[PDB]
Design an enzyme around this catalytic site. Structure first.
Site, PDB file in Angstrom:
ATOM      1  N   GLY A 191       0.805  -1.229  -0.077  1.00 36.27           N
ATOM      2  CA  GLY A 191       0.112  -0.135   0.016  1.00 36.27           C
ATOM      3  C   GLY A 191       0.922   1.257  -0.011  1.00 36.27           C
ATOM      4  O   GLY A 191       2.020   0.884   0.064  1.00 36.27           O
TER       5      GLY A 191
ATOM      6  N   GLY B 287       0.947   5.723   1.218  1.00 37.49           N
ATOM      7  CA  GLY B 287       0.737   6.797   1.807  1.00 37.49           C
ATOM      8  C   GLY B 287       1.305   8.032   1.118  1.00 37.49           C
ATOM      9  O   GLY B 287       2.126   7.932   0.206  1.00 37.49           O
TER      10      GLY B 287
ATOM     11  N   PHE C 110       3.273   9.933   2.900  1.00 32.96           N
ATOM     12  CA  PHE C 110       4.755  10.087   3.439  1.00 32.96           C
ATOM     13  C   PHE C 110       5.603   8.806   3.266  1.00 32.96           C
ATOM     14  O   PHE C 110       6.640   8.824   3.673  1.00 32.96           O
ATOM     15  CB  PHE C 110       4.391  10.519   4.809  1.00 32.96           C
TER      16      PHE C 110
ATOM     17  N   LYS D 159       8.423  -0.226   5.622  1.00 32.66           N
ATOM     18  CA  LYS D 159       7.775   1.192   5.353  1.00 32.66           C
ATOM     19  C   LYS D 159       8.955   2.152   5.129  1.00 32.66           C
ATOM     20  O   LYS D 159       9.795   2.383   5.547  1.00 32.66           O
ATOM     21  CB  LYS D 159       7.136   1.790   6.570  1.00 32.66           C
TER      22      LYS D 159
ATOM     23  N   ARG E 259      -9.160   1.259  11.607  1.00 30.06           N
ATOM     24  CA  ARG E 259      -8.207   1.587  10.564  1.00 30.06           C
ATOM     25  C   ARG E 259      -6.614   1.500  10.872  1.00 30.06           C
ATOM     26  O   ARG E 259      -5.952   1.594   9.972  1.00 30.06           O
ATOM     27  CB  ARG E 259      -8.612   2.717   9.800  1.00 30.06           C
ATOM     28  N   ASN E 260      -6.381   1.793  12.241  1.00 25.61           N
ATOM     29  CA  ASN E 260      -5.229   1.718  12.898  1.00 25.61           C
ATOM     30  C   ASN E 260      -4.881   0.438  13.642  1.00 25.61           C
ATOM     31  O   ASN E 260      -3.757   0.755  14.483  1.00 25.61           O
ATOM     32  CB  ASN E 260      -5.182   3.298  13.755  1.00 25.61           C
TER      33      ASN E 260
ATOM     34  N   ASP F  84      -0.601   2.553  14.236  1.00 28.09           N
ATOM     35  CA  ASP F  84      -1.272   4.094  13.986  1.00 28.09           C
ATOM     36  C   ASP F  84      -0.952   4.345  12.745  1.00 28.09           C
ATOM     37  O   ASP F  84       0.393   5.136  12.524  1.00 28.09           O
ATOM     38  CB  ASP F  84      -0.867   4.922  15.082  1.00 28.09           C
TER      39      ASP F  84
HETATM   40  C1  A4U Z   1       1.647  -0.507  11.810  1.00 23.37           C
HETATM   41  C2  A4U Z   1       1.885   0.792  10.553  1.00 23.37           C
HETATM   42  C3  A4U Z   1       2.234   0.492   9.314  1.00 23.37           C
HETATM   43  C4  A4U Z   1       2.307   1.358   7.814  1.00 23.37           C
HETATM   44  C5  A4U Z   1       2.555   2.855   8.547  1.00 23.37           C
HETATM   45  C6  A4U Z   1       2.648   3.300   9.881  1.00 23.37           C
HETATM   46  C7  A4U Z   1       2.093   2.090  11.147  1.00 23.37           C
HETATM   47  C8  A4U Z   1       2.064   2.794  12.285  1.00 23.37           C
HETATM   48  O1  A4U Z   1       1.363   2.059  13.314  1.00 23.37           O
HETATM   49  N1  A4U Z   1       2.817   3.697  12.972  1.00 23.37           N
HETATM   50  C9  A4U Z   1       2.800   4.218  14.142  1.00 23.37           C
HETATM   51  C10 A4U Z   1       3.496   5.513  14.386  1.00 23.37           C
HETATM   52  C11 A4U Z   1       3.355   6.135  15.798  1.00 23.37           C
HETATM   53  C12 A4U Z   1       4.258   7.802  15.982  1.00 23.37           C
HETATM   54  N2  A4U Z   1       2.991   8.506  16.268  1.00 23.37           N
HETATM   55  C13 A4U Z   1       3.668   9.672  17.152  1.00 23.37           C
HETATM   56  C14 A4U Z   1       4.024  11.039  16.549  1.00 23.37           C
HETATM   57  N3  A4U Z   1       3.031  11.375  15.752  1.00 23.37           N
HETATM   58  C15 A4U Z   1       3.274  12.502  15.063  1.00 23.37           C
HETATM   59  C16 A4U Z   1       2.856  10.213  14.573  1.00 23.37           C
HETATM   60  C17 A4U Z   1       2.372   8.947  15.117  1.00 23.37           C
HETATM   61  C18 A4U Z   1       2.936   5.599  17.222  1.00 23.37           C
HETATM   62  C19 A4U Z   1       2.258   4.312  16.881  1.00 23.37           C
HETATM   63  C20 A4U Z   1       1.597   3.289  18.161  1.00 23.37           C
HETATM   64  C21 A4U Z   1       2.631   2.539  18.702  1.00 23.37           C
HETATM   65  C22 A4U Z   1       1.610   2.024  17.918  1.00 23.37           C
HETATM   66  C23 A4U Z   1       2.251   3.605  15.355  1.00 23.37           C
HETATM   67  O2  A4U Z   1       2.877   3.735   7.578  1.00 23.37           O
HETATM   68  C24 A4U Z   1       1.660   3.782   6.481  1.00 23.37           C
HETATM   69  C25 A4U Z   1       2.355   3.936   5.019  1.00 23.37           C
HETATM   70  C26 A4U Z   1       1.414   3.910   3.845  1.00 23.37           C
HETATM   71  C27 A4U Z   1       0.929   2.623   3.300  1.00 23.37           C
HETATM   72  C28 A4U Z   1       0.076   1.762   4.024  1.00 23.37           C
HETATM   73  C29 A4U Z   1      -0.685   0.841   3.131  1.00 23.37           C
HETATM   74  C30 A4U Z   1      -1.829   0.105   4.143  1.00 23.37           C
HETATM   75  N4  A4U Z   1      -1.475  -1.086   4.584  1.00 23.37           N
HETATM   76  C31 A4U Z   1      -2.088  -2.305   4.886  1.00 23.37           C
HETATM   77  O3  A4U Z   1      -3.011  -2.710   4.084  1.00 23.37           O
HETATM   78  C32 A4U Z   1      -1.091  -3.392   5.633  1.00 23.37           C
HETATM   79  C33 A4U Z   1      -1.122  -4.787   5.170  1.00 23.37           C
HETATM   80  C34 A4U Z   1      -0.436  -5.729   6.021  1.00 23.37           C
HETATM   81  C35 A4U Z   1       0.431  -5.331   7.085  1.00 23.37           C
HETATM   82  N5  A4U Z   1       1.503  -5.710   7.852  1.00 23.37           N
HETATM   83  C36 A4U Z   1       1.958  -4.965   8.531  1.00 23.37           C
HETATM   84  C37 A4U Z   1       1.660  -3.645   8.299  1.00 23.37           C
HETATM   85  N6  A4U Z   1       0.629  -3.682   7.132  1.00 23.37           N
HETATM   86  N7  A4U Z   1      -0.157  -3.050   6.645  1.00 23.37           N
HETATM   87  C38 A4U Z   1       1.836  -2.221   8.705  1.00 23.37           C
HETATM   88  C39 A4U Z   1       2.015  -1.095   8.799  1.00 23.37           C
END
Ligand code: A4U
Length: 298
Positions: free
Chosen positions: A24, A26, A28, A51, A157-158, A171
Site C-alpha cells: 500500500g 501513503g 509520506f 515502510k 483503521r489503525n 497507527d
Molecule cells: C503499523 C504501521 C504500518 C504502516 C505505516 C504506519 C504504522 C504505524 O502504526 N505507525 C505508528 C506511529 C506512531 C508515532 N506517532 C507519534 C507521532 N505522531 C506525530 C505520529 C504517530 C505511534 C504508533 C503506536 C505505537 C503503535 C504507530 O505507514 C503507512 C504507510 C502508507 C502505506 C500503508 C498501506 C496500507 N497497509 C496495509 O493494508 C497493510 C497490510 C499488511 C501489514 N502488515 C504490517 C503492516 N501492514 N499494512 C503495517 C503497517
C-alpha cells in the site's frame, strides 16, 4: 498519533531485506512486503512489512517513531523489529499482518460460504469473535494507558489483524490517505478524527487517557457495526454538533445490550465519569472467554 507523554532502536542490514511487492501507499511513504533474513533465529527467512520514508525533517520524525515503537512492545502492539538507516531510503521493519487493517477486515466479514478462510469461519463474525477482537484492542490500550501514553487516533483503521485473528494496535500512516473521509481538515495541514473524538477534545483541545476510553467506545462500535463509519449519515460539522451536544451512537444490530452498556460507560460526558480502560477490558475479556451457553443468551 502517539503523543503520548539512536541506537535504542535495533538495526537491520539492507542486504538482509528483500522487497517483494508493494502492499500500500501513503503521502509520506510506501509499505512493502519483504523477506527478512537472519531476523529471528527459528525462522531462516520470514515475511515482514517495510515502510520506506518518502523524503529532510522526516529523518527526525523517523527517529522519533522508531524509538517509540521499540519502547512500546507488548502482545497487542504491532511488533517492531528495527530500522535500516544503511543508506537511503530509510526503512522501518515491522511484523506482517496478513489480514491488513482491522477496518478492512471487519467489512470483508460483515453481512453478507466464500468469506470464510484459514483463520475465519464463514459468514458474519460471531459474537464471541467480535468480543475477542474488542478484548484484544482494549488490552493494547490498557498497556498504553499503563505507561501513561496517549493514542490520539484510536480507530479500527489503525489496528492490524494477523494469523489466527491476532489483533494488534498500530497507527497509520496511510489513514490520512484514502481513509480521508474519517478526518476533518482544520487549518492548512492538520487533520482531526473528529468522529472518534470526545467533547473535551473538540471543545477544549484536550486529549487525555480518559479521551482514549471514549475513542475506544467508538472502536467497539466500529467492530459491532462491522467497520461502519461513526455518524456516517452526518457531515463533519454535523458530527461535531452531535458529539458536543451529547448525542450518542445507536446500538448496532449485532451488539447485545450487555455490550452496549460498556459503550455508554465509555461515553460519559465528563471524562472522570467514564470507566477506566483496565475495567472495560476486564468486562470484555470476561465475555470473550465466556462459554457459548452464556453468550448464546446475551
Ligand atoms: C503499523 C504501521 C504500518 C504502516 C505505516 C504506519 C504504522 C504505524 O502504526 N505507525 C505508528 C506511529 C506512531 C508515532 N506517532 C507519534 C507521532 N505522531 C506525530 C505520529 C504517530 C505511534 C504508533 C503506536 C505505537 C503503535 C504507530 O505507514 C503507512 C504507510 C502508507 C502505506 C500503508 C498501506 C496500507 N497497509 C496495509 O493494508 C497493510 C497490510 C499488511 C501489514 N502488515 C504490517 C503492516 N501492514 N499494512 C503495517 C503497517
Amino acid at each position: 498519533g502517539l503523543q503520548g507523554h539512536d541506537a535504542c532502536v535495533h538495526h537491520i542490514k539492507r542486504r538482509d531485506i528483500v522487497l517483494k511487492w508493494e502492499l500500500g501507499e501513503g503521502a509520506f511513504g510506501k509499505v512493502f512486503l519483504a523477506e527478512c533474513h537472519n531476523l529471528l533465529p527459528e525462522q531462516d527467512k520470514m515475511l515482514v512489512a517495510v515502510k520506506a520514508l518518502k523524503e529532510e525533517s522526516a529523518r527526525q520524525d523517523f527517529q522519533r517513531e522508531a524509538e517509540l515503537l521499540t519502547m512500546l512492545q507488548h502482545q497487542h502492539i504491532v511488533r517492531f523489529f528495527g530500522v535500516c538507516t544503511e543508506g537511503r531510503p530509510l526503512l522501518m521493519v515491522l511484523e506482517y499482518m496478513r489480514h491488513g487493517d482491522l477496518n478492512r477486515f471487519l467489512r470483508s466479514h460483515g453481512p453478507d460460504l466464500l468469506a470464510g478462510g484459514e483463520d475465519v469461519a464463514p459468514g458474519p463474525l460471531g459474537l464471541g469473535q467480535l468480543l475477542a477482537v474488542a478484548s484484544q484492542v482494549a488490552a493494547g490500550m490498557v498497556y498504553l494507558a499503563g505507561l501513561h501514553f496517549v493514542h490520539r487516533d484510536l480507530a479500527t483503521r489503525n489496528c492490524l489483524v494477523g494469523q489466527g485473528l491476532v489483533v494488534k494496535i498500530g497507527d497509520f500512516g496511510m489513514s490520512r490517505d484514502i481513509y480521508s473521509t474519517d478526518y476533518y481538515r482544520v487549518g492548512g495541514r492538520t487533520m482531526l478524527p473528529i468522529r472518534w473524538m470526545p467533547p473535551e477534545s473538540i471543545l477544549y483541545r484536550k486529549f487525555t487517557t480518559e479521551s482514549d476510553v471514549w475513542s475506544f467506545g467508538v472502536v467497539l462500535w466500529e467492530i459491532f457495526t462491522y467497520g461502519k463509519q461513526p455518524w456516517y449519515q452526518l457531515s463533519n460539522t454535523e458530527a461535531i454538533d452531535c458529539i458536543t451536544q451529547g448525542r450518542e451512537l445507536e446500538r448496532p444490530r449485532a451488539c447485545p445490550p450487555e455490550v452496549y452498556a460498556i459503550m455508554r460507560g465509555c461515553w460519559q460526558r465528563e471524562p472522570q465519569q467514564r470507566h477506566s480502560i483496565k475495567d472495560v477490558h476486564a468486562r470484555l475479556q470476561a465475555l470473550a472467554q465466556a462459554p457459548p451457553v452464556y453468550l448464546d443468551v446475551l
